[PDB]
From a paper:
In type III-A CRISPR–Cas systems, the RNA-guided multisubunit Csm effector complex targets both single-stranded RNAs and double-stranded DNAs. In addition to the Csm complex, efficient anti-plasmid immunity mediated by type III-A systems also requires the CRISPR-associated protein Csm6. We report the crystal structure of T. thermophilus Csm6 (TtCsm6) at 2.3 Å resolution and show that the protein is a ssRNA-specific endoribonuclease. Csx1 has been shown to be required for the interference activity of a type III-B CRISPR–Cas system in Sulfolobus islandicus. Both Csm6 and Csx1 proteins share an overall architecture defined by an N-terminal CARF domain (CRISPR-associated Rossman fold) and a C-terminal HEPN domain (higher eukaryotes and prokaryotes nucleotide-binding domain) that contains a conserved R-X4-6-H motif.
TtCsm6 crystallization was dependent on the presence of Ni2+ ions, which allowed us to solve the structure using single-wavelength anomalous diffraction (SAD) phasing. The TtCsm6 homodimer resembles an elongated X-shape with overall dimensions of ∼120 Å × 70 Å × 60 Å. In the TtCsm6 structure, the floor of the HEPN domain cleft is lined with side chains of the invariant residues Arg415, Asn416, and His422 from the R-X4-6-H motif. The Asn416/His422 side chain pairs from the two HEPN domains bind a single Ni2+ ion in a tetragonal planar coordination. Consistent with the observed ssRNA-selective ribonuclease activity of TtCsm6, the width of the cleft would permit binding of a single-stranded nucleic acid substrate, while sterically excluding double-stranded nucleic acids. Taken together, the structural features of TtCsm6 dimer thus suggest that the protein contains two ligand-binding sites: a putative allosteric ligand-binding site at the interface of the CARF domains, and an ssRNA-binding cleft located at the HEPN domain interface, which harbors the ribonuclease active center.
Residue numbers in the entry:
A (entry chain A): -2 to 167, 170 to 345, 349 to 367, 371 to 464
B (entry chain B): 0 to 15, 22 to 164, 171 to 346, 349 to 367, 371 to 464
The structure:
């Protein structure tokens, strides 16, 4: 590699020329710079891994040489030079040492805002190709602004990379001739493994449990730390729980508690809220078992199911009305059914009862109106309240008559058997009624801490 | 105090580098000590972190300017020889931390540790001194961590051959969003790409509020149309689509990027119109609205298949039910159109499928409706293998048995999958018998 060799020889000759005592600036300009330029012309030195760039953008200040090296090292077809007004005079020489067509763009020395604007415009212009942002030359504000722009815009233009010419200083108070290397400045997200936890925590606070679980699981692979696995389990539980997959939720929670039990994890932050987690997993057990059993005697399973549905209805209430009404309807139906289970039957209708019920329903809304084989929602209200039901007897008639409209419409909704779009006031009425019943049932149940919200992550 | 510094600078230029030291330095120092000059708007800092390269003076002025009680100095091997002068000029004790000159990841690690140590106080990250990799690294770390430590700020000392002594200003470096409002736009696009249509709509609305441009109001109407569509509120979706279409008709917007997809857009809005008609009439003669409703429900089922299997089962059940009901409308029947020879024939058909004493409810269920439609030689259903009808029979019986309707079952993914495939075939058949236009399926690309 002769160019490299005759260059090292020129560096030692330079050493002796400055040891003799000449002004080393001109001795560098004549002795060294054309051989270094030659070395980078023939074979650009890039690290850590070689890359192809379609576009390169370069801040420019006092030192044209390093920018020339950076242009040659990125090897882009299209080249932009973000330069201060003073350094425009350097652009012909920059054009000559480099042999590229340059696109100059003038920027004030303190104008960081303009750096941001120029990067944004340039990425809108080149949105699908690898782009190199070279911060080597310029004021601290220009270079830091370019790096900050690159890393920020990587979120929307993932082929952007930030680069710079790393020079190592080695008597001769100057970088050694052949040691400069074009490097990629690593993104802080890339370079810090554990910061994924921050992202995960953020996503956990907003209830996006699946994505938080993904961040935790991948962090296990990257950093090799198994504590995050536990966090993953937790998020997955809350995902399966919110998805009404109670079996998957219970499985994940049991695995999590079994991990929290080992001595190796006694100091895991999740052990600080261990009581609440055991209460929640207990809820999951009760619900899973009640789903298998369909027995309305197990009050705790009915409670967990209904409460989960009501939580989902309240979360859907503003942006997904039809969904919300579906959830709320199933909750209220379950709760009324447990009320009936307090009595004898699930169908046990005597004719004195059937007649008295036609009376009750008729007086509510015409006694000719007929009653179906399985009891409706308002049907169920009338049968239970007709039997003086404590929480259903407390009902106000003003509310009752306005609910009556919503209660007939349960199977008639878009997502069950009909085409109704729900009236939001009807959704709120169903939800409020369901909530009062949920509270009465909660009173006659054996409950843990009763913590609705997911557990705080502890870090 | 500062006028005095100016007098010293004119006297400097007249007496004209060590004379910059002796003449000017302690007066500049003293100006920064007495009242530090911080811009654009001053503030207090609890923690200060400084990279240190070859220029200890600017770092001294930065340490004074930030006014922090705890000062961390991130220095190179060489830079250690500057630590006394720093302590002498600032009059502060310093926590030194050694770094390599291009060890950027050690800068990132240090900032991370220091922010874990000080999570709820204003922290100034000063990049004035250091290699390009050190300063760029500190700025990058500051802006990245700002999302999780909002009180972090990045700062720097802003500057004949020397800069005039009184003009140095400790400045706060803005992050890109602070300096460029329009990037909230980019955020919108990302949300729009992920399906969170409401948040995209709100973003575009705010952009109209600030920039005063109505094109982003068109984008907001687009996102709101898709949000209402996804929520199965076809009235509001039809509303927003109508208005937007009327705008893209107007001449003021002839170059709007959305017009670049108008042929798709129109079709979708027509679809909404059809659906609205159907929903008001409950009349299965309106084939277009049936197709639009069933297709929306099937898209929702597919997007919920992985994570929300219960919800996806509900969606797919409703789609399949609507499609079978339309197949029934072909024969001019509904839901009660039974005669005894037919009911018995269906008992024998169903029993042969699954024991010939089965009960048929008054109103037909999914499996009952399907077998009945075979008993009437309906074409699309008639070309099912008896094997796959046996394999679908279980999932077809659980129509009202699912957790989200009348029962408690969790779906097997094969059951939801098979019901969604059956409904898909019926949907293609109905697609032949409608004219819904170009009908691009996914949301139209924003066009920027
Ligand atoms: Ni040679
Ligand atoms: Ni990550
Ligand atoms: Ni979401
Ligand atoms: Ni919640
Ligand atoms: Ni039903
Ligand atoms: Ni989709």
């Amino acid at each position: 590699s002769n160019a490299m060799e005759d260059l090292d020889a020129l560096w030692e000759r330079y050493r002796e020329a400055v040891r003799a005592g000449g002004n080393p600036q001109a001795l560098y300009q004549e002795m060294v710079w054309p051989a270094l330029l030659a070395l980078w012309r023939e074979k650009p030195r890039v690290y850590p891994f070689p890359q192809a760039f379609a576009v390169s953008v370069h801040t420019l200040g006092t030192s044209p040489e390093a920018t020339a090296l950076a242009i040659l090292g990125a090897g882009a077809e299209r080249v932009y030079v973000l330069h201060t007004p003073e350094s425009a005079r350097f652009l012909p020489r920059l054009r000559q040492d480099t042999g590229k067509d340059l696109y100059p763009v003038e920027i004030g020395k303190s104008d960081v805002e303009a750096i941001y604007r120029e990067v944004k415009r340039l990425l809108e212009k080149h949105p699908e190709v690898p782009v190199a942002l070279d911060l080597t030359s310029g004021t601290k504000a220009m270079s830091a602004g370019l790096a900050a722009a690159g890393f920020f815009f990587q979120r929307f233009y993932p082929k952007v990379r930030v680069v710079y010419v790393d020079n190592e200083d080695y008597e001769l108070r100057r970088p050694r001739a052949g040691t400069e290397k074009l490097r990629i400045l690593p993104n802080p997200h890339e370079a810090l493994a554990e910061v994924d936890a921050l992202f995960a925590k953020e996503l956990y606070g907003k209830g996006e449990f699946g994505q938080a679980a993904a961040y935790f699981r991948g962090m296990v692979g990257r950093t090799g730390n198994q504590a995050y696995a536990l966090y993953a389990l937790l998020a997955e539980m809350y995902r399966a729980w919110r998805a009404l997959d109670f079996g998957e939720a219970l499985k994940a929670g049991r695995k999590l508690l079994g991990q929290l039990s080992q001595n190796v994890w006694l100091n895991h932050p999740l052990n600080a809220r261990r009581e609440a987690l055991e209460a929640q997993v207990a809820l999951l057990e009760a619900v899973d078992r009640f789903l298998k059993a369909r027995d309305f005697a197990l009050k705790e399973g009915v409670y967990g199911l209904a409460r989960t549905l009501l939580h989902l209805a309240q979360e859907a209430k503003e942006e997904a009305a039809v969904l919300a009404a579906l959830y709320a309807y199933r909750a209220l139906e379950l709760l009324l059914q447990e009320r009936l289970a307090l009595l004898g039957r699930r169908p046990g209708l005597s004719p004195e009862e059937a007649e008295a019920l036609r009376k009750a329903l008729a007086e509510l809304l015409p006694e000719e109106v007929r009653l179906p084989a399985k009891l409706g929602l308002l049907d169920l209200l009338a049968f239970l309240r007709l039997k003086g039901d404590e929480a259903l007897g407390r009902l106000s008639l003003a509310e009752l008559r306005g609910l009556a409209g919503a209660l007939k419409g349960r199977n008639s909704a878009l997502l069950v058997h009909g085409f109704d779009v729900p009236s939001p006031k009807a959704v709120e009425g169903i939800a409020r009624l369901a909530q009062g019943l949920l509270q009465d049932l909660e009173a006659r149940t054996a409950l843990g801490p009763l913590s609705p919200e997911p557990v705080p992550l502890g870090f």
